[PDB]
Amino acid sequence: VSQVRQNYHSDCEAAVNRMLNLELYASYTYSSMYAFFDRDDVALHNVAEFFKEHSHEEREHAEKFMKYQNKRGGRVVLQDIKKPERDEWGNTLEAMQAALQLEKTVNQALLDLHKLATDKVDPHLCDFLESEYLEEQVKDIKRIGDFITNLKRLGLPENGMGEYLFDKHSVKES
Amino acid sequence: VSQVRQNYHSDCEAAVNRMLNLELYASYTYSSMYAFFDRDDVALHNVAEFFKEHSHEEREHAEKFMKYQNKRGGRVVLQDIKKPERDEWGNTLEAMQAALQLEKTVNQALLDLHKLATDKVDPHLCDFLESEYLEEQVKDIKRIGDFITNLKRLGLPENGMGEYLFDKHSVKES
Amino acid sequence: VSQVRQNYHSDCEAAVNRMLNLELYASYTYSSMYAFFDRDDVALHNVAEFFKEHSHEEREHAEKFMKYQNKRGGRVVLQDIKKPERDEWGNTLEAMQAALQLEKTVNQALLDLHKLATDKVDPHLCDFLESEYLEEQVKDIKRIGDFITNLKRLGLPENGMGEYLFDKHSVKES
Amino acid sequence: VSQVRQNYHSDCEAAVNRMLNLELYASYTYSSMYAFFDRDDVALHNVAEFFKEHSHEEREHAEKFMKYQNKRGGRVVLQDIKKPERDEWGNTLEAMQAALQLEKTVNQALLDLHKLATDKVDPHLCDFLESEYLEEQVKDIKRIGDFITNLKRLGLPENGMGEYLFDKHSVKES
Ligand SMILES: [Cl-]
Ligand SMILES: [Cl-]
Ligand SMILES: [Cl-]
Ligand SMILES: [Cl-]
Ligand SMILES: [Cl-]
Ligand SMILES: [Cl-]
Ligand SMILES: [Cl-]
Ligand SMILES: [Cl-]
Ligand SMILES: [Cl-]
Ligand SMILES: [Cl-]
Ligand SMILES: [Cl-]
Ligand SMILES: [Cl-]
Ligand SMILES: [Cl-]
Ligand SMILES: [Cl-]
Ligand SMILES: [Cl-]
Ligand SMILES: [Cl-]
Ligand SMILES: [Cl-]
Ligand SMILES: [Cl-]
Ligand SMILES: [Cl-]
Ligand SMILES: [Cl-]
Ligand SMILES: [Cl-]
Ligand SMILES: [Cl-]
Ligand SMILES: [Cl-]
Ligand SMILES: [Cl-]
Ligand SMILES: [Cl-]
Ligand SMILES: [Cl-]
Ligand SMILES: [Cl-]
Ligand SMILES: [Cl-]
Ligand SMILES: [Cl-]
Ligand SMILES: [Cl-]
Ligand SMILES: [Cl-]
Ligand SMILES: [Cl-]
Ligand SMILES: [Cl-]
Ligand SMILES: [Cl-]
Ligand SMILES: [Cl-]
Ligand SMILES: [Cl-]
Ligand SMILES: [Cl-]
Ligand SMILES: [Cl-]
Ligand SMILES: [Cl-]
Ligand SMILES: [Cl-]
Ligand SMILES: [Cl-]
Ligand SMILES: [Cl-]
Ligand SMILES: [Cl-]
Ligand SMILES: [Cl-]
Ligand SMILES: [Fe+2]
Ligand SMILES: [Fe+2]
Ligand SMILES: [Fe+2]
Ligand SMILES: [Fe+2]
Ligand SMILES: [Mg+2]
Ligand SMILES: [Mg+2]
Ligand SMILES: [Mg+2]
Ligand SMILES: [Mg+2]
Ligand SMILES: [Mg+2]
Ligand SMILES: [Mg+2]
Ligand SMILES: [Mg+2]
Ligand SMILES: [Mg+2]
Ligand SMILES: [Mg+2]
Ligand SMILES: [Mg+2]
Ligand SMILES: [Mg+2]
Ligand SMILES: [Mg+2]
Ligand SMILES: [Mg+2]
Ligand SMILES: [Mg+2]
Ligand SMILES: [Mg+2]
Ligand SMILES: [Mg+2]
Ligand SMILES: [Mg+2]
Ligand SMILES: [Mg+2]
Ligand SMILES: [Mg+2]
Ligand SMILES: [Mg+2]
Ligand SMILES: [Mg+2]
Ligand SMILES: [Mg+2]
Ligand SMILES: [Mg+2]
Ligand SMILES: [Mg+2]
Ligand SMILES: [Mg+2]
Ligand SMILES: [Mg+2]
Ligand SMILES: [Mg+2]
Ligand SMILES: [Mg+2]
Ligand SMILES: [Mg+2]
Ligand SMILES: [Mg+2]
Ligand SMILES: [Mg+2]
Ligand SMILES: [Mg+2]
Ligand SMILES: [Mg+2]
Ligand SMILES: [Mg+2]
Ligand SMILES: [Mg+2]
Ligand SMILES: [Mg+2]
Ligand SMILES: [Mg+2]
Ligand SMILES: [Mg+2]
Ligand SMILES: [Mg+2]
Ligand SMILES: [Mg+2]
Ligand SMILES: [Mg+2]
Ligand SMILES: [Mg+2]
Ligand SMILES: [Mg+2]
Ligand SMILES: [Mg+2]
Ligand SMILES: [Mg+2]
Ligand SMILES: [Mg+2]
């Protein structure tokens, strides 16, 4: 037993490792979206940079789980990072829809981890999830939903001018 | 009944007073460690200053419970602060081992208080513990465990050179 | 055919995707080393930070291949990022030995890619490898070899004091 | 024989003069595009300025070949700069398509010169081409391809609003 370990259930330790993997998976998916929007036959560079930024954020969230694991006396166990579901992402609307689904998948896993931590009476883990993950998750879901609404308003997928304008006005110029 | 009191159970009020006492006890133990490492026949002054700092931190945490008690309309009730378990602390490894145990004792009392606050459906007290005590506790336990690992690596208790080097490189120069 | 594509062989495009994967694999291995040295029963934090930095560097090198692929009109194709070979890394000497091997594996793949680019008469790709990858690779191999020499000099694996001192003097304080 | 000349083949000297001429030709073509977009019945001034900038860049690249020739002990030999292929350039999409073709023609000539320098075992000339010409060429081809993709997305040639918006958002305001 680790000398630091206190009130940290084996099930929570394992679930933290699984959540770490999911954050890495999410990061990799966003990296794929970045590369897609940087293609010469896609060429929406502010959209590309948006997804690149989100890839980096998810990788930071994975690292934060590694640090958490060690702080509690658990042991990091890594698994393969599966490649993303798609090799090409269609257009800005399709990609944003996939991102919304991904963020809700990650949110569900965080909420499930919170249920487990609650079950095992681990208030430190509950607080960590609430303070470092749950609020920023709701904000990302809201932002992406807002974007989807605007992409539909702009006539995606058919309205190429609308898609061009979204890249200029909705996502930060990069 | 205090005019400010709302949703604050007598049992929680009493447990806050007990936790206050434990913080004061922890502070006093760290003060003893400070004085020990400042002895001319011990003379590890950065180690001494580390424990002096932790003594001050625990006293601040006691004061924060006093303020909390009054904010909720409870009444501070003080008891004797018992002297520390030992009069002399052996060496840096022995002291760090005792500090680890002390921090885990304090953590257990905080977790028990959180269980009580949860039982009595006091989300303010739960949040206070989570936001002001539980995370910094995990960090202190991790730091001290890391130190113990390094002290063993350095050949404590027998390796006096190792102990000298720990005082120069592991704890902040004071 | 991509409208930008010129003098870019399908074989080179595929090899760039494979090299991208290898950079991601290397990044992941370094992340594992970071997490290991951050364990409370390992606790060599400057060593941990060294490997964290190298993980970030390799991820940047992967991103640079993505950008390269798109600049030439190739298409990024991602595969699973395999988990690292080990779950625990022994000690600083064992980890550094594994890092040396990893950097030489990456170097060999870069040199093989250069051979292919030379075969296909692609001077842009040759220059990219020479200017962005090959020199920094030689420097990393030299640095890690120098470290291994010093770890052996310090009496690793048996000399715990030597290992402690390496973490204080050889790797940047983090 | 020039007193400075060493390892510089007559064929390479001649090919450098031909490449100089091609850079001047490219500059002149871009100047024609500038003047076209500045016409009162065309009036896309940011597009005009984009082409003016590229004209200046190509003239700088011609000058760099003159300097190179003299450094190696070759002799600059100038020929007529042929007028551009067209007197009018249609619209932003047509012009960008012609620019893409021009940049790929220049790239092919650079790659052919590199083949010759390789044949004649002239590493100085190979390095000069790789370090001063080949990478910036790939970048220009990628940028122009990205633009063409966006012009098609914006509904060129028929969508005049799309063309107006490209001039405001895609090319630097001048
Ligand atoms: Cl436990
Ligand atoms: Cl408990
Ligand atoms: Cl357990
Ligand atoms: Cl696991
Ligand atoms: Cl997993
Ligand atoms: Cl599987
Ligand atoms: Cl796909
Ligand atoms: Cl979807
Ligand atoms: Cl999903
Ligand atoms: Cl949050
Ligand atoms: Cl929007
Ligand atoms: Cl009450
Ligand atoms: Cl209530
Ligand atoms: Cl009550
Ligand atoms: Cl009481
Ligand atoms: Cl008490
Ligand atoms: Cl008593
Ligand atoms: Cl005693
Ligand atoms: Cl003890
Ligand atoms: Cl204790
Ligand atoms: Cl806290
Ligand atoms: Cl230490
Ligand atoms: Cl090709
Ligand atoms: Cl060619
Ligand atoms: Cl091919
Ligand atoms: Cl491939
Ligand atoms: Cl692969
Ligand atoms: Cl496999
Ligand atoms: Cl292992
Ligand atoms: Cl190895
Ligand atoms: Cl390897
Ligand atoms: Cl390099
Ligand atoms: Cl060294
Ligand atoms: Cl010569
Ligand atoms: Cl020679
Ligand atoms: Cl000759
Ligand atoms: Cl000539
Ligand atoms: Cl000519
Ligand atoms: Cl002629
Ligand atoms: Cl014409
Ligand atoms: Cl054309
Ligand atoms: Cl042409
Ligand atoms: Cl260049
Ligand atoms: Cl654009
Ligand atoms: Fe995340
Ligand atoms: Fe405390
Ligand atoms: Fe690399
Ligand atoms: Fe040029
Ligand atoms: Mg142990
Ligand atoms: Mg377990
Ligand atoms: Mg999973
Ligand atoms: Mg698979
Ligand atoms: Mg599809
Ligand atoms: Mg509950
Ligand atoms: Mg709660
Ligand atoms: Mg909270
Ligand atoms: Mg919050
Ligand atoms: Mg966020
Ligand atoms: Mg998110
Ligand atoms: Mg998130
Ligand atoms: Mg908003
Ligand atoms: Mg009253
Ligand atoms: Mg009472
Ligand atoms: Mg007590
Ligand atoms: Mg007594
Ligand atoms: Mg004793
Ligand atoms: Mg907190
Ligand atoms: Mg603390
Ligand atoms: Mg503490
Ligand atoms: Mg504490
Ligand atoms: Mg630390
Ligand atoms: Mg096409
Ligand atoms: Mg192919
Ligand atoms: Mg591979
Ligand atoms: Mg496997
Ligand atoms: Mg092993
Ligand atoms: Mg270099
Ligand atoms: Mg490097
Ligand atoms: Mg390297
Ligand atoms: Mg490298
Ligand atoms: Mg060096
Ligand atoms: Mg002469
Ligand atoms: Mg001649
Ligand atoms: Mg010519
Ligand atoms: Mg003529
Ligand atoms: Mg015409
Ligand atoms: Mg050769
Ligand atoms: Mg070469
Ligand atoms: Mg070079
Ligand atoms: Mg270069
Ligand atoms: Mg250029
Ligand atoms: Mg050019
Ligand atoms: Mg050029
Ligand atoms: Mg660009």
Swiss-Prot record, chains A, B, C, D:
Its EC number(s): 1.16.3.1
UniProt KW Cell membrane keyword: no
InterPro entries: Ferritin, Ferritin-like, Ferritin-like_diiron, Ferritin-like_SF, Ferritin_CS, Ferritin_DPS_dom
Keyword Iron assigned: yes
Residues annotated as binding Fe cation 2: 58, 103, 137, 140
Pfam families found in the cross-reference section: Ferritin
PROSITE patterns, per the entry: FERRITIN_1, FERRITIN_2, FERRITIN_LIKE
Signal peptide coordinates: none
Family annotation (PANTHER family): FERRITIN
Designated name of the protein: Ferritin, middle subunit
